[PDB]
């Protein structure tokens, strides 16, 4: 029943975005996706997909690569040239997806932390980090108050006196 | 056959939406580059951390 953030797990119920908010207040529990940080991560992954095919490989008349007869020296060199090429490109492909996947995991992890810190900044001295990805907001925060946090218009001076009294 | 494909191999035409290819080192046209791997999976999403009870 109690809600928990990203430190512990992910949310299978979230389908309208990649990152989002869950809250529990006097009116009940709710969920909402954060679209800007969802698209900020998607924009980067789209950019990767664009850069991996951005260069066209267009080859026409090349060398012969299969042979029906034993010839010796020249054919040895033709086979060696093609095998060398394939091994180098096979290496380039293996390193590329490894580097890209490491960066994709990093950038998506970063978008989560940026949304958490962005929220931490808004709340200032009116909330505390519970340590599981959630904030304990020390004042009455109705649905309209939660939405002000989600859309970045929350004014901390309004609830500051109330929140400081509950914290201490 | 009656179709459209920029890339031709002795095995037949192949599309070129992927950067690499494992069908045949003999190609003609705008083709993916030939590699030895049969599959390379590029992540298009974040780490999947299924939820707790």
């Amino acid at each position, epitope marked *: 029943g109690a809600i928990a953030g990203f430190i512990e797990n992910g949310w299978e119920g979230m389908i309208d975005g990649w990152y989002g908010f869950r809250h529990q207040n006097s009116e009940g529990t709710g969920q909402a996706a954060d679209l800007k940080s969802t*698209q900020a991560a998607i924009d980067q992954i789209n950019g990767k997909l*664009n850069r991996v095919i951005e260069k066209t490989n267009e080859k026409f008349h090349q060398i012969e690569k299969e042979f029906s007869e034993v010839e010796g020296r020249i054919q040895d060199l033709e086979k060696y040239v093609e095998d060398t090429k394939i091994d180098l490109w096979s290496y380039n492909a293996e390193l590329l997806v490894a580097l890209e996947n490491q960066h994709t995991i990093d950038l998506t992890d970063s978008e989560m932390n940026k949304l958490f810190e962005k929220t931490r900044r808004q709340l200032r001295e009116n909330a505390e980090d519970m340590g599981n990805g959630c904030f304990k907001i020390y004042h009455k925060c109705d649905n309209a108050c939660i939405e002000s946090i989600r859309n970045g218009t929350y004014d901390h001076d309004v609830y500051r006196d109330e929140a400081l009294n509950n914290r201490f | 056959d009656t179709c459209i494909s920029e890339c031709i191999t002795p095995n037949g035409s192949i599309p070129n939406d992927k950067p690499f290819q494992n069908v045949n080192k003999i190609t003609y046209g*705008a083709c993916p580059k030939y590699v030895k791997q049969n599959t390379l999976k590029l992540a298009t999403g974040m780490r999947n951390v299924p939820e707790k009870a």
Partner: antibody
Amino acid sequence: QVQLVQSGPEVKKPGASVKVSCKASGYSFSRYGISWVRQAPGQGLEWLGWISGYTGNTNYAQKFQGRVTMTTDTSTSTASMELRSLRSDDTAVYYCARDKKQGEVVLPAASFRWFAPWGQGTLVTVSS
Amino acid sequence: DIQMTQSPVSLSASVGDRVTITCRASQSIGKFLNWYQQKPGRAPKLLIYYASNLETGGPSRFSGRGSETEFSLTISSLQPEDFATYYCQQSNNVPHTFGQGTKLEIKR
């Protein structure tokens, strides 16, 4: 039929502002964006900018920075374009077009980085 | 900005003819090039997207080719409906830019 329907024609005196709206139907308006393109009479097509129906993010051509504001409204599925400080050479037929899929990773051949469909057009005449 | 150059500026051909329009970018745009057909007095309409893909409605006599810097549009057997103006357009970088158009008219 996926469709963009634009507001009626406008006649404006120099120095005024014009606001043109595009109403979408037949598709998920919040999962795409809208690009605005204008065409002066007997001329070619010129890109003004783009706004996302998902985020509200905007891209303006440097030529129009400070003069254009694009807005999107999810509930009415309507995108708007406002051009300020109009001049005589702002006279054109203004088009909107659905552009760029949002909210999901897309391969290039499925990115919808192309203008389709188009609105019917909005004629804006700027003359004193 | 990236510049798009279309050739020829104008072209006259007969019904059943085979024609080819050319579009050129000042720098590489990948395959993010689109083609639009505009009939006089009407809004532009998408014909080819991502260099070579026919919009699902589209007639099979239109075909697109090219990548990077050089692109083409081909009509294998010209029909009366095909005589209009054709614009190529680049979607790789903002700001998106159009070619100046190729007007296709009937020979007589």
